[PDB]
Paper text:
The purified protein was crystalized and subjected to X-ray crystallographic characterization. Using molecular replacement (MR) with AfuA as a model, the structure of “APJL_RS02700” was solved and refined to a resolution of 1.75 Å (see Experimental procedures section and Table 1). The resulting high-resolution structure revealed a typical type II periplasmic binding protein with two β-strands connecting two globular domains. However, the binding cleft located above the β-strands at the interface of the two globular domains revealed clear positive density indicating a possible copurifying ligand. Further in silico screening of potential ligands containing six-member rings and phosphate groups indicated that the active form of vitamin B6, called PLP/P5P, best fit in the unmodeled electron density. The model of [name] with P5P in the binding pocket reveals a network of hydrogen bonds and hydrophobic clefts that primarily hold the pyridine ring and phosphate group of P5P in place. While Tyr103 interacts with the pyridine ring nitrogen and His203 coordinates the pyridine hydroxyl group, the phosphate group of P5P is stabilized by collective interactions with the side chains of Thr37, Ser147, Thr149, and Ser183 and the backbones of Thr37, Thr149, and Gly148. In addition, the dipole created the N terminus of three alpha helices beginning at residues Thr37, Gly148, and Ser183, respectively, and create a positive environment for the negatively charged phosphate on P5P. Moreover, the hydrophobic interactions with Gly36, Leu105, and Gln267 contributed to retaining the P5P molecule within this binding pocket. We determined a dissociation constant (Kd) of 36 ± 7 nM, which suggests that there is a strong interaction between [name] and P5P. Our structural analysis of [name] suggests that it is a highly specific transporter for P5P and does not possess the capacity to transport G6P because of a lack of hydrophobic interactions required to mediate binding of G6P.
Numbering used by the authors: 1 to 314
Write the structure that this text describes.
């Protein structure tokens, strides 16, 4: 007899499972709208004066942080925050009044081994390998209007190279890009062989390969970029009590195992008590950047960089 609307940036089948299970557990009529991180961020900004959802589940965390700075989020600290991996303690001190961490993702390349043979080039192992002229028209990555992935790409390259060389690299990469599309289409196009290599979070490439696509994952040489999955309650939510229960729910260990146990999707749990699938990469074995989520969570910085992508890249 209660209600709840979830803006959902995790996979559609996971959104469906999460909301259906919650609805039965609490007798709450639960609806969701699925969208990329940038898509949902845009909706929340546009709907500020009359919100159409109560909680935003999933998506890269810097747009969540930015929404918080813009006054778009409710303050609420779930008791389940205590179970977040301790490496995120300091970040949750600064941002956790309005955004919680519910998973993590590693940024890498997906490559279609069949397309690779057809182009006659070896699988790329470095960022600069993607600039090979043999890759003209064969690279895809997501459009930053819809996709938090592409903001993570920008932030990764800026931390690796400095901003000037980051945008120099992206301009050279743009010459090999066929089109920028929604992240899930990037993944689908790679599996089908419309593209030869893509940049994105690597859990999707593990799922694609397990489901029979000729796709391999590459962790690019050098420092590794990554993302956190955010969850935030929307300011002036219609259904605040149910939004808090849903927040507690997605912060719980069992809920963070449901993606791999029930859907073969491999976002890495951030609840210290949850078990990860062996198909997820282990970030502890990678050369992670000391990723400055707090800096790129600035609303000023996020808008400046998205506008700069749109003006300088295309
Ligand atoms: C669980 C999850 N979170 C976040 C993302 C990022 O999606 P997008 O780049 O469209 O914002 C993805 C897509 O790869 C995803 O599968």
């Amino acid at each position: 007899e209660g209600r709840l609307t979830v803006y959902c940036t995790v996979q559609n089948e996971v959104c469906e499972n999460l909301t259906q299970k919650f609805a039965k557990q609490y007798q709450v009529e639960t609806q969701f709208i699925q969208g990329g991180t940038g898509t949902i961020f845009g909706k929340i900004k546009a709907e500020k004066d009359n919100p159409q959802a109560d909680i935003w589940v999933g998506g890269t965390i810097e747009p969540h942080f930015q929404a918080g700075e813009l006054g778009l989020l409710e303050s609420y600290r779930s008791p389940k925050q205590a179970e977040i991996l301790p490496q995120f303690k300091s970040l949750m001190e600064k941002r956790g009044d309005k955004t919680s961490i519910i998973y993590m993702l590693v940024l890498g390349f997906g490559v279609n081994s069949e397309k690779l043979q057809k182009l006659g080039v070896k699988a790329p192992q470095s960022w600069d390998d993607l600039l090979n002229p043999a890759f003209k028209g064969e690279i895809q990555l997501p459009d930053p209007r819809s996709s938090g992935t592409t903001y993570t790409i920008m932030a990764t390259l800026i931390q690796k190279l400095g901003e000037e060389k980051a945008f120099e690299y992206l301009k050279k990469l743009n010459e090999n890009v066929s089109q920028y599309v929604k992240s899930n289409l990037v993944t689908a196009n790679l599996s089908r062989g419309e593209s030869s290599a893509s940049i994105g979070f690597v859990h999707a490439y593990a799922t694609e390969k397990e489901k029979g696509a000729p796709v391999e994952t590459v962790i690019p040489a050098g420092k590794v970029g990554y993302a956190l999955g955010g969850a935030s309650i929307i300011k002036n939510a219609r259904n605040l009590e149910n939004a808090k229960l849903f927040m507690d729910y997605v912060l719980s260990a069992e809920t963070q195992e449901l993606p791999w146990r029930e859907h073969g999707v491999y976002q890495i749990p951030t609840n210290a008590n949850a078990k990860a699938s062996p198909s997820s990469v282990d970030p502890k074995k990678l050369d992670l950047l000391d990723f400055d989520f707090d800096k790129f969570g600035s609303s000023e910085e996020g808008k400046r960089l998205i506008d700069k992508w749109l003006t300088e890249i295309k």
